[PDB]
Curated annotation (Swiss-Prot), chain B:
Keyword line: Cytoplasm, Hydrolase, Magnesium, Manganese, Metal-binding, Nucleotide metabolism, Nucleotide-binding, Nucleus, RNA-binding
InterPro entries according to UniProt: NUDIX_hydrolase-like_dom_sf (IPR015797), NUDIX_hydrolase_dom (IPR000086), NudT16 (IPR054754)
Described purpose of this protein according to its UniProt entry: RNA-binding and decapping enzyme that catalyzes the cleavage of the cap structure of snoRNAs and mRNAs in a metal-dependent manner. Part of the U8 snoRNP complex that is required for the accumulation of mature 5.8S and 28S rRNA. Has diphosphatase activity and removes m7G and/or m227G caps from U8 snoRNA and leaves a 5'monophosphate on the RNA. Also catalyzes the cleavage of the cap structure on mRNAs. Does not hydrolyze cap analog structures like 7-methylguanosine nucleoside triphosphate (m7GpppG). Also hydrolysis m7G- and m227G U3-capped RNAs but with less efficiencies.
EC number: 3.6.1.62, 3.6.1.64
Keyword Magnesium found: yes
Name of the protein described by the UniProt record: U8 snoRNA-decapping enzyme
Nudix hydrolase domain location: 20-168
Residues the entry annotates as binding Mn(2+) 1: 53, 74
Amino acid sequence: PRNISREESLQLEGYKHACHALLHAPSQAKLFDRVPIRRVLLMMMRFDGRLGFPGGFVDTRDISLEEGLKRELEEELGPALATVEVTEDDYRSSQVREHPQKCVTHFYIKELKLEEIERIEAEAVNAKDHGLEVMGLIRVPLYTLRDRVGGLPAFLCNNFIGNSKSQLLYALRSLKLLREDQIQEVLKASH
Amino acid sequence: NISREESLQLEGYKHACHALLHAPSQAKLFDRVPIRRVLLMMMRFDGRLGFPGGFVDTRDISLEEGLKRELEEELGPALATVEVTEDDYRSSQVREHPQKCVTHFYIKELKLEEIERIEAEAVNAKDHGLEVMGLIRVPLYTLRDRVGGLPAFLCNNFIGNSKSQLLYALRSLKLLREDQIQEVLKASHR
Ligand SMILES: [Mn+2]
Ligand SMILES: [Mn+2]
Ligand SMILES: [Mn+2]
Ligand SMILES: [Mn+2]
Ligand SMILES: [Mn+2]
């Protein structure tokens, strides 16, 4: 999994493209009324039994990266996304590979209002892809519990698709949620 | 393992109840792979997968009344009308080095629409976004690559003897035979 710029990857020939987004919102809620949730981050159980971000393959000879993302989000997350514009401003990074297959993955990150996230969750059951490609929506625990494992560390022990584990860790950094040491720490507690 | 009447009068041990709710399904994945059955589990606040339910004080209302409560709390209001009776009981396990606990497992077949209504109102549960970070369905099939679906699913991080219990259910409901179950774990483990 290699880093590459948007413009450079879009000039490539014979590559498959995918788009995936992290939809997130701040929250004041405290787990057990003591542990702050801080922010809601959405991921999913996929048909293949792995955790992933919503999104999928985009044909760039046909539609833009944003256009492809939009369609796949509405299919996977549901009608509530018709009110949700993920634009070029939301674009973050692009990784490329040639093995097993020549594949470029794009990652977006988009902040929403809490009630937006909540509407998305409420309406996900009505998605075309519910109970098929998408087996359920999930929130990422951002805290470590007193036992030093429960929460994010333990969650990172789940089974992730492609580079999704790495994209999330990037977002944790990008959104200033965890310091590099906190991130390294979480990864150790995870074993 | 353990036993029900042997378990319910221990001494000091803490008691928990969890349930697998499931329904038959005609749906097919890529218009190819049958779903067969919809089985509910969840992502917990601690980052692990588990069944809904929780602790129930043995002296404070029956094992079923503990469960039904923890169900409405975690899965939501829809459950008030779910009837998780004594006949829905299935097993108990004893542990010690952890907290000394008795886990009671319950399997109850519902109608699909009922599962659908449970997933749809789950976002209204007292514990949505607190104890319960989201419901999921258990993929029962195995993909052409012979890893995706259930075997990949068993590599996720499960609480307690949650995995154990699920394997039990799959045999309990004649969903997979013992060798098929073994095939799945051998694919899973690697
Ligand atoms: Mn997808
Ligand atoms: Mn898709
Ligand atoms: Mn409880
Ligand atoms: Mn509970
Ligand atoms: Mn619980």
